[PDB]
């Protein structure tokens, strides 16, 4: 059972892709993908089909957030690309930079930059990832969320992992700066909230003691003490 022919493994991968499209069963998809790449690795198969399998599993593991599985897939894809395989080098280099942003690995980002070519950096996905990394490191939440709004490919799926913490940092910066009140419409615009309901759902657990009975705006002077809690 450990030795599985490549043709049967291709058929299984196609069936799992179709099943994920039809039903989106994440536990079944992850179990199937893990078995597939286990059978690939026990046989030491490093080829275009291997890079395709790892790409498919990494893309599946972003619709349902699984940082561990995505990290496994991407750290295998790095070596698969280094072995002169076609894959999607620009796309998954963008995803690698984005995951390093998520885990806050400045050294890994520097290492990735040290091996970027002109034709790679010309890719739109990696260009968006580099712009997002610059906005995040520079603390530019406006550019960060402007790029997060229209994120090419599945970049937004990665950004969603640290979108909430970036929003919290941006809100701390805004409360420390916007006085005597901060309109919630400004939060809606800056933090890239697709709905007043979603914006208020994000705002509610913090408990920032909004001004006015209707809670039209955040009272930042009163909420300054609340900043340290979150």
């Amino acid at each position: 059972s450990t030795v599985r022919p490549v043709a049967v493994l291709k058929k299984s991968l196609c069936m799992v892709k179709c099943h994920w499209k039809e039903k989106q069963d994440y536990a079944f998809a992850c179990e199937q993908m893990k078995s597939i790449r286990q059978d690939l690795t026990v046989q030491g198969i490093r080829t275009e089909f291997t890079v395709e399998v790892y790409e498919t599993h990494a893309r599946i593991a972003l619709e349902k957030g699984d940082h561990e599985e995505f990290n496994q897939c991407q750290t295998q894809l790095k070596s698969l690309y280094a072995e002169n395989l076609p894959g999607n080098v620009g796309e998954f280099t963008a995803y690698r930079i984005l995951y390093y942003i998520f885990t806050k690995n400045s050294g890994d980002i520097t290492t990735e930059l040290a091996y970027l070519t002109r034709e790679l950096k010309a890719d739109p996905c990696v260009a968006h990832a580099l712009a997002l990394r610059t906005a995040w490191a520079l603390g530019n939440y406006h550019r960060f969320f402007r790029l997060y709004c229209h994120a090419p490919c599945m970049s937004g799926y990665l950004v969603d992992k640290f979108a909430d913490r970036e929003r919290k940092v941006a809100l701390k910066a805004m409360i420390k700066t916007f006085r005597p009140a901060l309109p919630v419409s400004y939060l809606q615009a800056e933090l890239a909230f697709e709905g007043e309901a979603a914006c208020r759902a994000f705002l509610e657990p913090l408990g920032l003691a909004y001004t006015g009975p209707d809670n039209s705006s955040i009272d930042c002077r009163l909420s300054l003490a609340q900043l340290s809690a979150f």
């Binding site: 790449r37 286990q38 690795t41 026990v42 030491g44 940082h67 561990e68 599985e69 990290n71 496994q72 991407q74 750290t75 295998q76 790095k78 070596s79 690698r96 390093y100 885990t103 690995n105 890994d108 006085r179 005597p180």
Partner: protein
């Protein structure tokens, strides 16, 4: 305008190849199918390869045993008729499992020899095994190891990697702790000590780290 007034998978991109392990060890790692190291592996392998003491508390199934298996296989200088790695655990099942892990991670290093001893079997057989082909790794229960060290059938003067599996279970008891203390006393003072267990209570942590010289402690 008023004026302003004053887990199971590591999250690091570092595979087993990034641990600078032996090629014969990396081949076995790939063969067994370990794609990406666990968090405890990523935290303990670099420290354990350098021959330094380790204290680890991690849940079962997180690749805890493979950590010290790779650690002891990396720094193994195998010479005939000499034991340099000793593994002690309170259960025969764990000893058999760790012996199987050692066998699995050494299919590309024919020099390394591993032997297993436990209760329920005649000590004469263990003495015959030690004399006929003295291994470089010995895995066993504290009682059998203590008996073999007492009856002068096993040479403990060459131990350089003395490690415990489920250190909590052994160090909670009294007879087991006495046997462990005696065996550690017989071993040389220049060696590496590592202790792995599932649940390390704060009462056993001092008596657990009493056997190590500035160990790296990690608890999950």
């Amino acid at each position: 305008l008023l004026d302003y007034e004053d887990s199971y998978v590591s999250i690091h991109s570092s595979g087993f190849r990034d641990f600078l392990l032996k090629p014969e060890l990396l081949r076995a790692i790939v063969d067994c199918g370990f794609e990406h190291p666990s968090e405890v592996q990523h935290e303990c392998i670099p420290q354990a390869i350098l021959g330094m003491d380790v204290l680890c508390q991690a849940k079962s199934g997180m690749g805890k045993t493979a950590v010290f298996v790779l650690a002891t296989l990396q720094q193994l200088x195998p010479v005939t008729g000499q034991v340099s790695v000793l593994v002690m655990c309170h259960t025969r099942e764990l000893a058999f499992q760790i012996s199987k892990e050692y066998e699995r991670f050494s299919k590309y290093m024919p020099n390394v020899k591993v032997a297993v001893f436990f209760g329920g079997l005649s000590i004469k057989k263990d003495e015959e095994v030690l004399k006929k082909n003295c291994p470089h790794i010995v895995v066993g229960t504290p009682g059998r190891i203590l008996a073999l060290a007492r009856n002068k059938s096993l040479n403990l003067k060459h131990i350089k990697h003395f490690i415990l599996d489920e250190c909590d279970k052994m160090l909670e008891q009294l007879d087991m702790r006495r046997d462990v203390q005696e065996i550690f006393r017989m071993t040389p003072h220049e060696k590496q000590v590592m202790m792995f267990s599932a649940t390390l209570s704060k009462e056993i942590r001092p008596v657990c780290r009493k056997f190590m010289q500035d160990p790296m402690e990690i608890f999950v």
